[PDB]
Amino acid sequence: AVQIGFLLFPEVQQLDLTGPHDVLASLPDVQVHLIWKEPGPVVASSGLVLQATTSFADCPPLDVICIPGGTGVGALMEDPQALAFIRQQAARARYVTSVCTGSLVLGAAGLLQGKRATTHWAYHELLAPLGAIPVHERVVRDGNLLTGTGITAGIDFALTLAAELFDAATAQRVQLQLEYAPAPPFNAGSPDTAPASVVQQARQRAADSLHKRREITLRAAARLAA
Amino acid sequence: AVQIGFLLFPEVQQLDLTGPHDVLASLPDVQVHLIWKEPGPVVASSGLVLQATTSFADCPPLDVICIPGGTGVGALMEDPQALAFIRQQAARARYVTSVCTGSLVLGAAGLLQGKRATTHWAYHELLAPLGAIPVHERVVRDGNLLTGTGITAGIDFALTLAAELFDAATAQRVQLQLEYAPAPPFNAGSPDTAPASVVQQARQRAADSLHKRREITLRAAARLAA
Numbered sequence: 416a417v418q419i420g421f422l423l424f425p426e427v428q429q430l431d432l433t434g435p436h437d438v439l440a441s442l443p444d445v446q447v448h449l450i451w452k453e454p455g456p457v458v459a460s461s462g463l464v465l466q467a468t469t470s471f472a473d474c475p476p477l478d479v480i481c482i483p484g485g486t487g488v489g490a491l492m493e494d495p496q497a498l499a500f501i502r503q504q505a506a507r508a509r510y511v512t513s514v515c516t517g518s519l520v521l522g523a524a525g526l527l528q529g530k531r532a533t534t535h536w537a538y539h540e541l542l543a544p545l546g547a548i549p550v551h552e553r554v555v556r557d558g559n560l561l562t563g564t565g566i567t568a569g570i571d572f573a574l575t576l577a578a579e580l581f582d583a584a585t586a587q588r589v590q591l592q593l594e595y596a597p598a599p600p601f602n603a604g605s606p607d608t609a610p611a612s613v614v615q616q617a618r619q620r621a622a623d624s625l626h627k628r629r630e631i632t633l634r635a636a637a638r639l640a641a
Numbered sequence: 642a643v644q645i646g647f648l649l650f651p652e653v654q655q656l657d658l659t660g661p662h663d664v665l666a667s668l669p670d671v672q673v674h675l676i677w678k679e680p681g682p683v684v685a686s687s688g689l690v691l692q693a694t695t696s697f698a699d700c701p702p703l704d705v706i707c708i709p710g711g712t713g714v715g716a717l718m719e720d721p722q723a724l725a726f727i728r729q730q731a732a733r734a735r736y737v738t739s740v741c742t743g744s745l746v747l748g749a750a751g752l753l754q755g756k757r758a759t760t761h762w763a764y765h766e767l768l769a770p771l772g773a774i775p776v777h778e779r780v781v782r783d784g785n786l787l788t789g790t791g792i793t794a795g796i797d798f799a800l801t802l803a804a805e806l807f808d809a810a811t812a813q814r815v816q817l818q819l820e821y822a823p824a825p826p827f828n829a830g831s832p833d834t835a836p837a838s839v840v841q842q843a844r845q846r847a848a849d850s851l852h853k854r855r856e857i858t859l860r861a862a863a864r865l866a867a
Contacts, residue, residue: 430663433689437656437792440687447687456692461666461673463659466682466690515820536820553824566663566819567793575826587829587839592846593792594741594762596830597823598779600801603813604822613813620818 417580419479420448420504422497422520423467426487428566429459431514435481435569441589442577450474452496460486471500479576480504481569484515484535489628492523492635502526510576511560514569518562519628522547523635531557533564536606537621541628544636565604570595643806645705646674646730648723648746649693652713654792655685657740661707661795667815668803676700678722686712697726705802706730707795710741710761715854718749718861728752736802737786740795744788745854748773749861757783759790762832763847767854770862791830796821 419439421432432449440447451457451467458464482501491497501524505511513521518534521527522545532547533539533555542549554563554572563572574595578586603609609617645665647658658675666673677683677693684690708727717723727750731737739747744760747753748771758773759765759781768775780789780798789798800821804812829835835843 428663430659433656433659434793436689437654437687440689449689461663463662463666463675464692553822564820565823566821567660567796567823570793571823571825578826583827584836584839584842587827587835588842588846590825590827590829591832591835591839591843594790594830595792595825596779596834597791597793597797597825599797599816599821599823600804601809601813601816603816604820606817608822609813609817610810613810613817616810616814617817620814 417442417445417479418448418475418477419445419481420450420474420477421481421483422501423449423451423457423465424485424487424491424497425458426460426485426490427457427465427483428485428515429461429463429465430566431483431485431517431569432481434567435514435573438570438573438589438593439479439576441592442581442585448474448477450500471496474500474504477504477508479510479512480508482513482517482520483569484513484517484519486624488516488519489631491520492631498524509559512569512572512576513562515564515566518542519545519632521560521562525639526560528639530560531555532560532562534562535564537618537625538628541632544632546639567597643668643671643705644674644701644703645671645707646676646700646703647707647709648727649675649677649683649691650711650713650717650723651684652686652711652716653683653691653709654711654741655687655689655691656792657709657711657743657795658707660793661740661799664796664799664815664819665705665802667818668807668811674700674703676726697722700726700730703730703734705736705738706734708739708743708746709795710739710743710745712850714742714745715857717746718857724750735785738795738798739788741790741792744768745771745858747786747788751865752786754865756786757781758786758788760788761790763844763851764854767858770858772865793823
């Protein structure tokens with residue numbers, strides 16, 4: 416069975432995780448793990464309570480690891496236990512993936528050094544200090560690394576993974592079974608397409624978080640420099 | 642605060658729920674409830690464990706009710722407690738919504754009689770016996786009823802609801818904050834666009850479930866006829 420693991424941490428953006436989880440869990444001969452320091456409840460940033468299924472110590476070697484984003488990313492960027500786990504799994508995984516600000520965690524772990532990557536538009540400036548080559552595209556692949564943007568990036572890239580792990584027909588069948596054919600009623604999902612006034616409001620609301628994450632990023636970069 | 646409730650039941654398709662939940666929970670002055678017969682763990686069809694936050698008896702009057710789909714829909718279609726709750730909330734809700742096979746539950750509750758509605762493509766034949774006017778469109782509105790197809794229908798219609806409950810700028814801001822701009826790597830999300838061989842495989846895999854749901858639907862329709 417293909418072993419797929421998601422890191423589940425306090426203050427995760429749950430949809431970053433729950434989207435690809437439901438897609439990948441639809442495939443034959445896959446086992447999906449929700450990983451944290453111990454099994455038990457973990458609260459997402461919305462207050463939704465999820466349940467981790469395995470600890471770092473008990474997790475099997477993964478074929479796919481996926482790091483979601485969320486408010487809670489700041490803490491993870493300085494969690495040496497979590498970073499060590501990610502590095503250990505990444506060494507042998509067939510695919511190392513992230514959604515949204517999850518790529519900042521990969522960055523803190525040292526896994527973006529010299530790699531093309533993306534992250535959430537409001538935090539994109541934080542990639543370069545972590546050694547990445549920043550790319551403004553929705554899905555960026557570099558070898559076995561796949562970083563994506565958007566709360567539902569993992570749904571889209573899960574279909575890519577399905578096609579490569581199995582075959583295109585299998586990916587198409589899952590898409591059809593899920594009747595997955597999005598059609599957003601607005602076109603404001605990028606700072607390049609949203610109205611300027613909306614971009615300003617979003618930027619202002621992110622400013623405190625960005626400031627705090629600048630500080631964290633610099634400490635994380637210092638650790639990589641050592 | 643706008644009160645939004647999701648029915649959370651065993652064997653739910655969790656993404657049907659978790660998608661709109663994360664979008665709507667991003668809005669100011671909203672409270673989101675996960676409703677079942679009592680608070681506590683509820684297991685989704687993938688094995689993901691979620692937590693209901695309130696009981697039927699304690700739930701406040703809702704402004705929006707949303708019924709997700711999933712394997713577990715068959716049981717709900719004959720759960721008199723659940724159906725009575727849905728009817729009670731629907732009487733005063735500003736919006737009555739469903740995702741995927743959740744519309745079959747609205748049908749069993751009597752809420753589709755004479756109404757235009759959709760459901761999952763493989764189960765679409767079950768709408769007419771429940772009194773609906775079947776429509777092959779991704780989102781169907783009829784008065785305050787909104788039924789959608791696709792595992793992520795609720796993400797898209799949550800943006801519509803945001804715009805009507807608040808304003809378009811607010812919906813656009815949430816879309817931008819979430820960087821929501823899907824781009825599926827395949828085009829097989831409808832039986833009209835998928836390859837015929839894929840449609841056949843999907844139909845065959847749904848056949849047992851459809852057969853069982855035909856039986857349930859006829860019993861549910863008999864109750865409506867009384």
